[PDB]
Amino acid sequence: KTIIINGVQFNTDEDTTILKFARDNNIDISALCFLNNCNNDINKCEICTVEVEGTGLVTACDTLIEDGMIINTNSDAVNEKIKSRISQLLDIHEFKCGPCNRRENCEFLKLVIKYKARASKPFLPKDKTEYVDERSKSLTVDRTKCLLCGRCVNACGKNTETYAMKFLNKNGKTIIGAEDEKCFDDTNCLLCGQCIIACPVAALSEKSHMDRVKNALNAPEKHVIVAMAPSVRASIGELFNMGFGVDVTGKIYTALRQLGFDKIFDINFGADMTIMEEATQLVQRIENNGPFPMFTSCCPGWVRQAENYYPELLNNLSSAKSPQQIFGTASKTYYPSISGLDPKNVFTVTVMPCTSKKFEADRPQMEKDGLRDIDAVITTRELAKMIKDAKIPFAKLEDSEADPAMGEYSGAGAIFGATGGVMEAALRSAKDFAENAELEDIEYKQVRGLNGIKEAEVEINNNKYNVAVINGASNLFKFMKSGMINEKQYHFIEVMACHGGCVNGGGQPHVNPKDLEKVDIKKVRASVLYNQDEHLSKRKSHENTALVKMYQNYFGKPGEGRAHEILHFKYKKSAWSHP
Numbered sequence: 001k002t003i004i005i006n007g008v009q010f011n012t013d014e015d016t017t018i019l020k021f022a023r024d025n026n027i028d029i030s031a032l033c034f035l036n037n038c039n040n041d042i043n044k045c046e047i048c049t050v051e052v053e054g055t056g057l058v059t060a061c062d063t064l065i066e067d068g069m070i071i072n073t074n075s076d077a078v079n080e081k082i083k084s085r086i087s088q089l090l091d092i093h094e095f096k097c098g099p100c101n102r103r104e105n106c107e108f109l110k111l112v113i114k115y116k117a118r119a120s121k122p123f124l125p126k127d128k129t130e131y132v133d134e135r136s137k138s139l140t141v142d143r144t145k146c147l148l149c150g151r152c153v154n155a156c157g158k159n160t161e162t163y164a165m166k167f168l169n170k171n172g173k174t175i176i177g178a179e180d181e182k183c184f185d186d187t188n189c190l191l192c193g194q195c196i197i198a199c200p201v202a203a204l205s206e207k208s209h210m211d212r213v214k215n216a217l218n219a220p221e222k223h224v225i226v227a228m229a230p231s232v233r234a235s236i237g238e239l240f241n242m243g244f245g246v247d248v249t250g251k252i253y254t255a256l257r258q259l260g261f262d263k264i265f266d267i268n269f270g271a272d273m274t275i276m277e278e279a280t281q282l283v284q285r286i287e288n289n290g291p292f293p294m295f296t297s298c299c300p301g302w303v304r305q306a307e308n309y310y311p312e313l314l315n316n317l318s319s320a321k322s323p324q325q326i327f328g329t330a331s332k333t334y335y336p337s338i339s340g341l342d343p344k345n346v347f348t349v350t351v352m353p354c355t356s357k358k359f360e361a362d363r364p365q366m367e368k369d370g371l372r373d374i375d376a377v378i379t380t381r382e383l384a385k386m387i388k389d390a391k392i393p394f395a396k397l398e399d400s401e402a403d404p405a406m407g408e409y410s411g412a413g414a415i416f417g418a419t420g421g422v423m424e425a426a427l428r429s430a431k432d433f434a435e436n437a438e439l440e441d442i443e444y445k446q447v448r449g450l451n452g453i454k455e456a457e458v459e460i461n462n463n464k465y466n467v468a469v470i471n472g473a474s475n476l477f478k479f480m481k482s483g484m485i486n487e488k489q490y491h492f493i494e495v496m497a498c499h500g501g502c503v504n505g506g507g508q509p510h511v512n513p514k515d516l517e518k519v520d521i522k523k524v525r526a527s528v529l530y531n532q533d534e535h536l537s538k539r540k541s542h543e544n545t546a547l548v549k550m551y552q553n554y555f556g557k558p559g560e561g562r563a564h565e566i567l568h569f570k571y572k573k574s575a576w577s578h579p
């Protein structure tokens with residue numbers, strides 16, 4: 001219980017690692033491959049090296065403290081070891097930060113500066129083509145940056161339990177990649193991008209849509225609509241040193257105008273649309289007394305999980321399009337009818353916290369009359385890069401508002417970005433629809449928060465119903481495999497692939513791992529959303545006035561006829577085959 005670190009004595013009953021004990025006691029220990037409570041078991045980076053008297057050099061991140069330990073974190077032996085390991089990394093690292101997309105927030109660069117490290121022989125490949133894989137609609141790899149730290153492999157395992165990201169033996173050398181070095185899209189990968197979030201450097205990235213967007217903007221005849229996800233207004237401010245949990249909605253609208261977008265709408269409008277359709281489908285099922293359960297279908301990471309692991313549930317998914325695609329569909333049909341635009345000249349761009357959204361947008365059948373629902377999807381990070389490249393002073397911009405026709409949104413739509421958000425929003429409408437009433441108690445705190453699996457009983461029209469909120473792809477696996485699905489009859493289930501909801505999406509700003517233990521990123525980003533909900537006068541999707549008018553004037557009644565024909569999408573399992 002007694003340990004000495006750099007000459008300082010501590011008394012403690014704690015059972016923890018040297019790294020965690022030292023950092024709790026404000027002692028600096030560097031780390032690289034340690035993240036998500038694990039390190040690279042096979043190829044330890046050893047950046048967390050410390051000296052334990054009587055033992056030698058040990059890795060602090062996976063060595064437990066023991067009574068009587070005398071530890072030096074900053075001896076010559078230690079600093080030369082760490083510097084040596086960083087130098088070896090530089091030997092396989094294309095160290096050219098100028099045009100690098102992690103230039104502003106790279107963990108490796110920070111370590112190189114800290115230890116004054118240099119390559120024993122600079123790595124300068126002639127042909128990066130063999131190092132880069134951009135076949136995916138969603139994820140790209142640049143192995144000239146890869147430190148083989150395993151953080152993406154561990155994060156895939158931890159977050160999704162698919163292990164789609166693996167170590168591979170290629171040409172007799174170790175790389176990371178997909179099963180058999182396939183394109184990720186052709187594997188059980190969810191394209192959720194949690195591996196990207198985990199990456200300390202620029203080796204993993206989103207598939208860029210930025211030139212699709214800039215081309216559309218500069219095309220004379222193109223009318224470029226832009227619309228951002230719920231999570232974007234709660235996040236993007238982090239990349240302009242505005243801190244965490246800042247609502248920057250009004251600034252984003254202003255910046256998008258300054259970027260030259262022709263119409264400023266909002267995906268939250270599409271969220272209200274999804275609710276209109278999905279809550280209607282839920283009431284339909286309640287009155288048909290089936291089929292049950294109905295699952296949400298707005299998360300393309302979860303749709304891919306269902307496709308790849310549970311195709312028997314594909315017919316249990318709501319046929320309502322996701323906020324992105326339903327908005328997109330409306331952008332090519334309703335929007336011209338109220339604007340005069342030639343549908344073929346409309347180019348619809350979304351801004352998402354999500355890499356999987358790019359795959360969804362590019363699904364061959366997400367189209368009508370030769371017109372894509374969505375033409376481009378850029379991540380939070382990409383929009384930040386566009387803003388910085390345009391030299392727009394984001395933090396000092398005035399607030400503007402969205403164009404109302406497809407920009408208004410309710411508080412129900414606003415909270416989509418948090419785990420349990422869709423559930424809560426959908427219940428607010430379904431209850432009003434089924435009872436043909438406008439109920440006052442609308443908050444469903446039971447489905448909120450970061451618990452991995454959330455259940456609640458709701459009563460609708462003198463009948464009790466069972467709902468569940470699955471928070472993260474690994475938790476969907478747990479729910480199903482453990483038979484939790486069978487311990488009662490579920491009627492409506494929300495699934496999000498990313499733990500925390502879209503606020504923790506694969507397209508979101510990276511956050512430093514130590515600032516990550518300072519701030520709960522999942523809760524602080526979500527707090528912006530719930531707070532908008534609390535202060536909006538319209539808190540149900542079906543009270544959205546521009547939505548109501550669009551339905552009254554163009555689509556008709558949700559869930560039926562026109563709305564069904566246009567605003568819905570069904571996923572179908574493959575017929576039985578041998579082999």
Ligand code: 402
Binds near residue numbers: 418
């Ligand atoms: N389409 C859509 Fe969604 C909405 O609204 C986003 O835009 Fe999400 C967010 N934020 C993302 O990415 S998707 C999963 N449904 C919940 S939130």
Ligand code: SF4
Binds near residue numbers: 100107145
């Ligand atoms: S990954 Fe980091 S260290 Fe490597 S070139 Fe990019 S910014 Fe520089």
Ligand code: SF4
Binds near residue numbers: 155159190195
């Ligand atoms: S995108 Fe998601 S599922 Fe695919 S390798 Fe990365 S973490 Fe795993």
Ligand code: SF4
Binds near residue numbers: 147151198204
């Ligand atoms: S892609 Fe990134 S997280 Fe994965 S091993 Fe390479 S450097 Fe580490």
Ligand code: SF4
Binds near residue numbers: 300355503
């Ligand atoms: S939870 Fe949100 S960000 Fe994550 S994969 Fe699903 S839609 Fe994308």
Ligand code: FES
Binds near residue numbers: 030034039048062
């Ligand atoms: S951080 Fe401890 S071995 Fe990598």
Ligand SMILES: [Mg+2]
Binds near residue numbers: 039
């Ligand atoms: Mg370990």
Ligand SMILES: [Mg+2]
Binds near residue numbers: 218219224
């Ligand atoms: Mg233009």
